[PDB]
Amino acid sequence: DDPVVQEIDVYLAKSLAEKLYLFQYPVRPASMTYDDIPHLSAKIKP
């Protein structure tokens, strides 16, 4: 079992290391998204 194909490279980015967040909705299936829902604001704390 040799690496015949798919020798993909891996790069690293530090531009958004401190500005990248992951938001997941446990109650909203992936089929329906909030792209069409107009948002108003977002409160947050550092």
Partner 1 sequence: MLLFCPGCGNGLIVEEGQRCHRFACNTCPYVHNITRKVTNRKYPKLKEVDDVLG
Partner 2 sequence: IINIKKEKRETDEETKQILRMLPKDVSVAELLRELSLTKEEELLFLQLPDTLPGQPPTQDIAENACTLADLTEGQVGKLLIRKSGRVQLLLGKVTLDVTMGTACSFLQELVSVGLGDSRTGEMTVLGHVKHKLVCSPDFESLLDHK
Longest dimension (CA), the chain: 54
Q: d(Cα 28, Cα 10) in Å, to the nearest integer? A: 32
Write down the least CB distance from residue 37 to partner 2, Å.
11
CA 23-25-31 angle, to 5 degrees, is 110
Comparison of 37 and 42: residue with beta carbon closer to partner 1: 37
Q: How far is the CB of 23 from partner 1 (least distance, A)?
A: 17
Residue 10 binds: one of partner 2, partner 1, none (C-beta under 5 to 8 A by kind): partner 2
User: Closest separation between CB of residue 26 and partner 1, Å?
Assistant: 9
